[PDB]
Ligand SMILES: O=C(O)C[C@H](NC(=O)OCc1ccccc1)C(=O)O
Ligand SMILES: COC(=O)[C@@H](N)Cc1ccccc1
Ligand SMILES: COC(=O)[C@@H](N)Cc1ccccc1
Ligand SMILES: [Ca+2]
Ligand SMILES: [Ca+2]
Ligand SMILES: [Ca+2]
Ligand SMILES: [Ca+2]
């Protein structure tokens with residue numbers, strides 16, 4: 001839309017009030033002109049045709065139940081943009097301020113979210129397994145991070161490269177969650193998962209085994225399901241990332257934590273300089289070691305801790 005930049009107010013999926021950047025031209029649109037070439041949020045109207053209709057509102061107030069997933073998709077896309085710009089000097093997912101597009105109300109009872117190669121897409125959930133998936137900042141940032149990966153390393157979504165692709169999205173989804181600094185944790189999707197059950201999530205970085213995912217290469221899934229275990233074997237890398245940041249002793253191997261900012265710097269550099277579409281876990285270890293060496297020096301604690309973390313998860 002060509003219009004005037006405005007600021008609306010609304011409530012997200014969890015009932016929290018927030019301001020959102022909109023555009024006025026007859027209607028108020030979920031179009032944020034303040035970030036790159038724009039952030040745009042669409043109504044899929046319970047169908048599967050994408051993107052749907054650019055979100056229009058008569059009064060710039062977004063307090064209806066129907067509005068909530070749109071408010072959060074829009075707002076959290078903005079936060080994620082700010083993370084990548086302010087923390088990594090990256091302008092949108094392509095590094096050149098590409099427009100960021102999201103659609104909400106995708107399909108009916110849809111317990112998923114995704115990046116379709118061009119935009120983010122969020123189901124509303126069935127109300128049992130999930131509530132609308134844009135309610136989770138880690139979910140939103142997970143999805144935008146797929147776009148970042150696709151434009152950078154281009155990790156093929158199968159087997160080990162695919163599990164790295166997934167872990168990169170969990171890692172940066174979590175780092176974005178810490179950036180926004182509202183109830184941050186090392187768990188994935190907790191804000192929108194199982195409204196009837198307290199304290200659970202879909203995946204855990206701190207203890208992947210909590211939800212059945214491997215936390216050691218010896219436990220890797222070797223079958224055909226889930227594109228060769230991309231959401232399963234991600235646990236191995238997620239655990240390594242958690243260890244690098246927070247430290248711990250895992251399977252008898254002790255890791256000195258170097259904190260989340262350095263974790264993000266190391267992995268952002270590995271992703272954008274060293275990984276390739278076919279990188280496997282061993283190559284991820286090498287990429288991370290090289291990135292830490294570039295940033296902190298070969299004799300550094302940071303490099304030492306990256307090595308210990310990959311040792312701890314059995315990745316040589
Ligand atoms: O099925 C797919 O490939 C899309 C998958 N989506 C997915 O699992 O939807 C829910 C969710 C997303 C991120 C964090 C927690 C929950 C993905 O993005 O990897
Ligand atoms: C068979 O997969 C399952 O039952 C899933 N709930 C994963 C899981 C496995 C083991 C422990 C906890 C969770
Ligand atoms: C339902 O998917 C899950 O629970 C995931 N934790 C993947 C998984 C499935 C089965 C066994 C182990 C891991
Ligand atoms: Ca309204
Ligand atoms: Ca949280
Ligand atoms: Ca989380
Ligand atoms: Ca829950």
Ligand SMILES: [Zn+2]
Pocket residue numbers: 142146166169
């Ligand atoms: Zn993913």
